[PDB]
């Protein structure tokens, strides 16, 4: 019908959603968990340091074996680092030097990279010839790539700057499913432990939950007020925390569809670049534009500890599957492993 | 000690050596960036300096390898990837001279130049300014006064004064005159006139960087 009538209907639906959310909230998380004993001060030291790159590191992902991690930098080289022995397992020479995302397959056979170029290239690490090769090149996106993360050895969800997410098939190299619910360009991606639903954060200050099989936005969250650069999924799978550029990190949940609490401090004025969760979920390690990294108490919103080992913008932060150590990457060409 | 990890360490050392060689090769090679208004003449300067996403063109001139990047096919948020180009040797900004009455286009070009020159990620990089369609501007200036675009231009309607005023207005947008350069050049149809200016600006920036590293400046 008319545009005005549809806009009025959408406004009425948004008002109804807000009323339902408000009437379904009775007690805040902070007042529920105030009775919990405080975590206390946390001290972490740089157990390992990596200095093989020669440019700005933009991404880093942890393998499922908790031993190897892949790092991406603007020099055009992807390095598979050995965490225990501080060794370079492989060096991947990129055809395009512009890379801002990388991923490691759960089986460890494949890795993915992407950046300004609209291709999320897949490299095979188990070739018979002994050298890495470009297994597939996904060239269906029209904007800059932000994050493509593996689901299996044949499927991968890619988020690009054209405000659309895609579900690529490695064997056929085609978009099985395309998600077009976002209005702003998607920046970060995260996957649930059961690998059935995923939530993505865009620059429109909104995060949307998607279904891998069906392919529509089940829920959307508009608790922020600026661009969203980081997002992570709780190990339980019923909640997720995302960063933003207004020095605020908010923890949303899926079964209530509202913001449980927010993490912020008056001293902190810079945005959040990377967000990761520990195995327990008690500690929320969030990156920031300044040289240091902060560890937040998830259930109390308290500054548990500060990781200030870097001297430039922190870009990528990750926590291994077993939670033994935390790796922090920055633009100073240095990768540090904390524990 | 180690039993089989010695070969792994040797492989890591070989990878480190290869990475150092590649990094030295990349640092020896100059890096350039292209930006400007729509249809400003980028497709013309690309043909002048003879060789989807980012388009990369590589060419060697005077024993100096050039890397040139064109970003005109990305209809996304610029500030989400403008920091990815931090550290480029120079930025080539192209504005068509015969665009002062094309509606406002010159105002948009000035806005883009002000946004890119005052950006916090390019506070030290040099800017190479190219003015294309000079012949069209000379033909149009006779019939159309420059006061249409700039109402405060109290001058003659000849090519020299108009070009000087345009150059002065474009250079006045820079509020970082302390340690920044603006190499303004007028394009020519003849070859080896634009690439020569690019090489001169590049070697000037290289001299400036070497002096800064040596501590003289």
């Amino acid at each position: 019908s008319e545009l005005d009538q549809l806009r009025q209907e959408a406004e009425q639906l948004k008002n109804q959603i807000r009323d339902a959310r408000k009437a379904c909230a009775d007690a805040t998380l902070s007042q529920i968990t105030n009775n919990i004993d405080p975590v206390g001060r946390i001290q972490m030291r740089t157990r390992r340091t990596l200095r093989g790159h020669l440019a700005k590191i933009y991404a880093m992902h942890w393998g499922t074996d908790s031993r190897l991690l892949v790092s991406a930098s603007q020099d055009g080289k992807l390095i598979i680092w050995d965490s225990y022995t501080t060794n370079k397992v492989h060096a991947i020479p990129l055809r395009s030097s512009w890379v801002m995302t990388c991923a490691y397959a759960p089986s460890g056979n494949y890795v993915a990279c992407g950046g300004l170029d609209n291709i999320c290239s897949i490299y095979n690490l188990k070739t018979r010839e002994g050298n890495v090769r470009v297994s597939r090149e996904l060239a269906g996106h029209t904007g800059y790539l932000s994050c493509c993360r593996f689901l299996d050895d044949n499927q991968i969800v890619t988020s690009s700057g054209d405000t659309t997410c895609a579900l690529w098939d490695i064997e056929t190299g085609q978009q099985t499913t395309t998600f077009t619910g976002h209005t702003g360009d998607v920046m970060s991606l995260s996957l649930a432990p059961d690998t059935r639903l995923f939530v993505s954060g865009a620059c429109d200050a909104s995060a949307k939950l998607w279904d891998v099989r069906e392919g529509m936005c089940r829920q959307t969250f508009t608790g922020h007020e600026s661009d969203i650069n980081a997002i992570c999924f709780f190990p339980n799978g019923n909640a997720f925390a995302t960063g933003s550029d207004d020095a605020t990190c908010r923890l949303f949940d899926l079964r209530a569809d509202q913001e449980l609490m927010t993490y912020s401090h008056d001293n902190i004025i810079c945005g959040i670049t990377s967000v990761s969760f520990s195995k327990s979920g008690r500690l929320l390690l969030a990156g920031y534009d300044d040289f240091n990294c902060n560890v937040w108490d998830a259930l109390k919103a308290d500054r548990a500890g500060v990781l200030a080992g870097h001297d430039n913008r922190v870009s990528c932060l990750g926590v291994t599957d077993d939670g033994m150590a935390v790796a922090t990457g920055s633009w100073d060409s240095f990768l540090k492993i904390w524990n | 000690l180690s039993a089989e990890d010695k070969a792994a360490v040797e492989r890591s050392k070989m990878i480190d050596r290869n990475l150092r060689e590649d990094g030295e090769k990349a640092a020896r090679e100059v890096k350039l960036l292209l930006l400007g208004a729509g249809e400003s003449g980028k497709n013309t300067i690309v043909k002048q300096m003879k060789i989807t996403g980012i388009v990369e063109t590589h060419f060697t001139f005077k024993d100096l390898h050039f890397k040139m990047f064109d970003v005109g096919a990305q209809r996304s948020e610029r500030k989400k990837w403008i920091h990815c180009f931090e550290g480029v040797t120079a930025i080539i900004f192209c504005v068509a001279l015969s665009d002062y009455d094309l509606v406002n286009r010159m105002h948009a070009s000035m806005k883009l130049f002000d946004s890119i020159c005052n950006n916090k990620w390019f506070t030290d990089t040099s800017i190479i300014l190219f003015l294309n369609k000079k012949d069209l501007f000379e033909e149009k200036i006779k019939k159309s006064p420059l006061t249409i675009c700039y109402p405060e231009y109290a001058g003659s309607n000849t090519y020299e004064e108009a070009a000087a005023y345009i150059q002065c207005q474009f250079e006045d947008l820079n509020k970082r005159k302390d340690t920044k350069e603006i190499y303004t050049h007028f394009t020519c149809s003849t070859d080896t006139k634009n690439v020569q200016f690019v090489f001169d600006a590049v070697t000037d920036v290289i001299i400036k960087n070497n002096l800064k590293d040596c501590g003289l400046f």
Partner: single-chain antibody
Amino acid sequence: VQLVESGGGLVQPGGSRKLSCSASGFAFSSFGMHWVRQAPEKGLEWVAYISSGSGTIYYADTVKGRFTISRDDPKNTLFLQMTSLRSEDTAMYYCVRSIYYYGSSPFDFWGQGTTLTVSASADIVMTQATSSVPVTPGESVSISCRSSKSLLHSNGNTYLYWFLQRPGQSPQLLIYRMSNLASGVPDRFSGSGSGTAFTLTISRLEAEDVGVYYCMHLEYLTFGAGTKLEL
């Protein structure tokens, strides 16, 4: 992945010979190489090893000084020049590729080898006993091996390898590090051990596994005596 060997033939004792290996289908520059010598009646014997960067060259106790090994990465050819040969070296040699990194499978591919005929301590010793083990198709056969020194390194990885050499065929890697199965082999093969005694088990045996099994990497690479299965 192909490894063609050349340079064999009858040679008078006390002379010199050159062995050449041609490598194709894989990145030869980033692959370490080994030379394995097998006597007409005895088992496999290690000779020499050269790394990817042509450094850290190792030789056997009875090979050091007498033999030299070099590689040509641009030519994709391995050269093994032998001088002052005697009657104890009348055996066919093998060229083995091996790349060493986390999760790698060294000694995965073995060359065809060439026959060479000559006319007239402190090292880990692998015994493995079991000279002959009669087998029946469809049954389960277990192969046991023993090592003088414990192979369980301080890093938690035990360096043990199992090789299968079918009659008139080049040896193939079955299990590396006694717990990881090599690529391209059936899953029925299994391996286990406690650092001193190692056991290789085959389930649902058929006629394609008839051959001689060899066992080995903590220090420089003695082979086992060799267990032969008779069908």
